[PDB]
Amino acid sequence: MKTRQNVYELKDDTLSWYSRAVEEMKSRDINDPTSWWYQGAIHGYATYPSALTYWHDATGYPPSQQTVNSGFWNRCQHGTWYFLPWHRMYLFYFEEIVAKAIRDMGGPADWTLPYWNYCEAYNTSASPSNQQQALQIPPEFGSSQGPNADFASLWIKNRRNYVLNKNNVNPWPAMNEAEFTNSGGDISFGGGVTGFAHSGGQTGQLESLPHNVVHTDINGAMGNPDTAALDPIFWLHHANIDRLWQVWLAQAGRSNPVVNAWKDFRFKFHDANGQPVEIAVKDVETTQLLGYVYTPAFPLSVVGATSASFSVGDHMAPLDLTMVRTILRISNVKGKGATSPIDLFITNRDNEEGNEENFVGCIGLFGLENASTPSSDGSGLNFAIDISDTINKLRQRDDWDEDNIRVQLIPQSKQDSDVEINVGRVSLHS
Residue 78 among known ligand-binding residues = yes
Number of other CB atoms surrounding residue 170 within 10 Å: 19
Number of other CB atoms surrounding residue 70 within 10 Å: 16
Contact yes or no for 194/81 (Cβ under 8 A): yes
Return the SS3 of 179: coil
* Phi–psi pair at 92, nearest 5 degrees: -50, -50
Contact yes or no for 128/304 (Cβ under 8 A): no
Residue 215 among known ligand-binding residues = yes
Contact yes or no for 249/255 (Cβ under 8 A): yes
The single-letter DSSP state of residue 318 is: P
Chain breaks of the chain after residues with C–N above 2.5 Å: 301, 324, 375
CA–CA dist 251, 308 (Å, integer): 40
Contact yes or no for 20/102 (Cβ under 8 A): yes
Task: Transcribe 192-215 into DSSP letters.
Answer: ---SS-SS-S---HHIIIIIIHHH
CA–CA dist 51, 53 (Å, integer): 5
The single-letter DSSP state of residue 16 is: H
Residue 198 among known ligand-binding residues = no
Contact yes or no for 34/96 (Cβ under 8 A): no
Q: How many CA atoms lie within 13 A of 120 on its CB side?
A: 22
Residue 87 among known ligand-binding residues = yes
Residue 211 among known ligand-binding residues = yes
Return the SS3 of 82: coil
Residues annotated in the binding site, as ranges? 43, 78, 87, 211, 215, 238
Residues flagged as binding site for Cu cation: 43, 78, 87, 211, 215, 238
